[PDB]
Amino acid sequence: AAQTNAPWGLARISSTSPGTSTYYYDESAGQGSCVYVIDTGIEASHPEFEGRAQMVKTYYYSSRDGNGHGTHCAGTVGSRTYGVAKKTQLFGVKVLDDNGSGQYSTIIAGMDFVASDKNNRNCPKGVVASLSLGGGYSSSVNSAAARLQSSGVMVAVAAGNNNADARNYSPASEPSVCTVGASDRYDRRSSFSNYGSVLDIFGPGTDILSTWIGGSTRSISGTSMATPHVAGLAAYLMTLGKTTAASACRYIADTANKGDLSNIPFGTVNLLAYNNYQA
Ligand SMILES: NC[C@H]1CC[C@H](C(=O)O)CC1
Numbered sequence: 001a002a003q004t005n006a007p008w009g010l011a012r013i014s015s016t017s018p019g020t021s022t023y024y025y026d027e028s029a030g031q032g033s034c035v036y037v038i039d040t041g042i043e044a045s046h047p048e049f050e051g052r053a054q055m056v057k058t059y060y061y062s063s064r065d066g067n068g069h070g071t072h073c074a075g076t077v078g079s080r081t082y083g084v085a086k087k088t089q090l091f092g093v094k095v096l097d098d099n100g101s102g103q104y105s106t107i108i109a110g111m112d113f114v115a116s117d118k119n120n121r122n123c124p125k126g127v128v129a130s131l132s133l134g135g136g137y138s139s140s141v142n143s144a145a146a147r148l149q150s151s152g153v154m155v156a157v158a159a160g161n162n163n164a165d166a167r168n169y170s171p172a173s174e175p176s177v178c179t180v181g182a183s184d185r186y187d188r189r190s191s192f193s194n195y196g197s198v199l200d201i202f203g204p205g206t207d208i209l210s211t212w213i214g215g216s217t218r219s220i221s222g223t224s225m226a227t228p229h230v231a232g233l234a235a236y237l238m239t240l241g242k243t244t245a246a247s248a249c250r251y252i253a254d255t256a257n258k259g260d261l262s263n264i265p266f267g268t269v270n271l272l273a274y275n276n277y278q279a
Pocket residue numbers: 118119120121122123124125126127152
């Protein structure tokens with residue numbers, strides 16, 4: 001399948017070269033998989049989600065996304081126009097309030113929730129979790145991310161936006177999950193992207209167009225935007241049967257475009273997520 005005039009990041013995911021604008025992908029499009037977006041919520045009524053999004057948990061007085069960030073991330077995973085995996089099921093877990101803030105205790109509870117709740121959901125092709133959040137190092141936060149991964153969920157986490165080594169951030173620094181840095185449309189490391197040996201992969205993160213609250217769209221930047229590209233890619237590849245939740249981060253790294261990014265510090269992987277689709 002081909003989506004013309006796609007956002008640059010989707011085109012980049014499906015290309016061996018920068019500078020193209022069509023997204024190419026197998027039409028299965030993640031059908032039968034499910035992706036949990038653990039964030040500020042998802043505006044499930046947005047036309048871009050086509051009924052495939054649903055809030056399943058909140059830790060606040062409402063399940064509504066009053067911020068926009070969670071809706072944007074969910075759109076990059078799975079919206080019809082802005083999403084990698086256009087037929088996946090999206091499940092919202094609101095661990096961040098409408099100012100984008102949340103306690104680590106709440107974030108941990110949300111991760112434990114997904115590890116159990118997946119067993120109440122029909123996801124025959126596999127389960128992914130996208131965590132576009134983090135803060136300073138916490139052993140408890142890393143352990144919760146490691147538990148979620150071990151339960152059979154492909155966990156993708158943002159490296160962080162401090163232009164610093166991600167070893168000092170959580171859940172970015174947990175070795176067993178998939179830690180995602182950000183690149184721009186000229187194949188440069190994004191100016192804010194964290195780096196370091198803990199990173200597993202880069203995805204598009206600068207100037208990413210996706211869904212927003214109020215039935216709208218906008219472009220924003222962050223490792224928070226690169227993470228759902230990788231999460232959606234994992235759901236897409238799992239639906240194709242190419243990999244599993246336990247192996248998808250390694251598979252994405254094995255099949256990535258290698259050596260194409262600039263301003264990668266010595267010691268950080270030079271790997272850009274790629275779907276390897278040939279029509
Ligand atoms: N691993 C639990 C979750 C993944 C798929 C499973 C199934 O589809 O049989 C039930 C929900």
